[PDB]
Design a protein around this motif. Structure first.
Motif, PDB file in Angstrom:
ATOM      1  N   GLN A  28       0.800  -1.229   0.000  1.00 28.82           N
ATOM      2  CA  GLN A  28       0.000   0.000   0.000  1.00 28.82           C
ATOM      3  C   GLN A  28       0.842   1.293   0.000  1.00 28.82           C
ATOM      4  O   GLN A  28       1.983   1.300   0.473  1.00 28.82           O
ATOM      5  CB  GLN A  28      -1.021  -0.001   1.157  1.00 28.82           C
ATOM      6  N   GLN A  77      -6.583  -6.873  -8.034  1.00 32.60           N
ATOM      7  CA  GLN A  77      -6.822  -5.631  -8.774  1.00 32.60           C
ATOM      8  C   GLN A  77      -8.283  -5.232  -8.768  1.00 32.60           C
ATOM      9  O   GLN A  77      -8.605  -4.075  -8.465  1.00 32.60           O
ATOM     10  CB  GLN A  77      -6.305  -5.715 -10.223  1.00 32.60           C
ATOM     11  N   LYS A  80      -9.337  -4.240  -5.183  1.00 29.31           N
ATOM     12  CA  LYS A  80      -8.766  -2.948  -4.834  1.00 29.31           C
ATOM     13  C   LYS A  80      -9.387  -1.791  -5.602  1.00 29.31           C
ATOM     14  O   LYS A  80      -9.557  -0.717  -5.049  1.00 29.31           O
ATOM     15  CB  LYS A  80      -7.243  -2.957  -5.016  1.00 29.31           C
ATOM     16  N   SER A  81      -9.727  -2.007  -6.866  1.00 27.55           N
ATOM     17  CA  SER A  81     -10.382  -0.968  -7.658  1.00 27.55           C
ATOM     18  C   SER A  81     -11.863  -0.782  -7.284  1.00 27.55           C
ATOM     19  O   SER A  81     -12.474   0.226  -7.636  1.00 27.55           O
ATOM     20  CB  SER A  81     -10.245  -1.253  -9.148  1.00 27.55           C
TER      21      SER A  81
END
Ligand code: 3TB
Length: 146
Positions: A28, A77, A80-81
């Motif tokens: 992060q 991905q 997280k998106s």
């Protein structure tokens, strides 16, 4: 001083500092800030070198570790998106029995799980998700819920 497992790293593409955890494989931008039991969900992708190359999704699992990691990376991905949530992808895509419970495994203590999974699970804080975690079952994304 950074929670257990966390280290400073330098982004190759941007030169911005970020934080990596060598236990959970979490990554992060933000600066990061023990219990008897934890509760976790997970999303397992098995490969051909899995201790049991079979699941409810397919009778024979023939994908390589590399391909399994590709899949895991893509799920991370999407999570997280915000395009997909963890629970949805665990239900559809986890090579674990626990897929039927949105990847929920219930609570557990030290001494029950394969050691990398356990270490990762116990280094996560409530709410946090791991990066790819490698065990003899396959590759996990781990979410600590309690
Ligand atoms: N002291 C130790 N080293 N003991 C070894 C503990 C290993 C075992 N598994 C795991 O740790 C991994 C991580 C979470 C899910 C998991 C494995 C599986 C799916 O992966 P596979 O097993 O098909 O490769 N999950 C499940 O729910 C179960 N049906 C699988 C199961 C586990 C133990 C006995 C019977 C069935 C466990 N006892 O939890």
């Amino acid at each position: 001083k950074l929670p257990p497992g966390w280290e400073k790293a330098m982004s190759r593409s941007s030169g911005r500092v970020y934080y990596f955890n060598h236990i959970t494989n979490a990554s992060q931008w933000e600066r990061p800030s023990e219990p008897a039991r934890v509760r976790c969900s997970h999303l397992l992708v098995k490969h051909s070198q899995s201790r049991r190359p079979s699941s409810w999704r397919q009778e024979k699992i023939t994908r390589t570790k590399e391909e399994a990691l590709e899949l895991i990376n893509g799920y991370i991905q999407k999570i997280k998106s915000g395009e997909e949530d963890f629970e949805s992808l665990a239900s559809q895509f986890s090579d674990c029995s626990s897929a039927k419970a949105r990847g929920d495994l219930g609570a557990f203590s030290r001494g029950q799980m394969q050691k990398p999974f356990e270490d990762a699970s116990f280094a996560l804080r409530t709410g946090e998700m791991s990066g790819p975690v490698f065990t003899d079952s396959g590759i996990h994304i781990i979410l600590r819920t309690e």
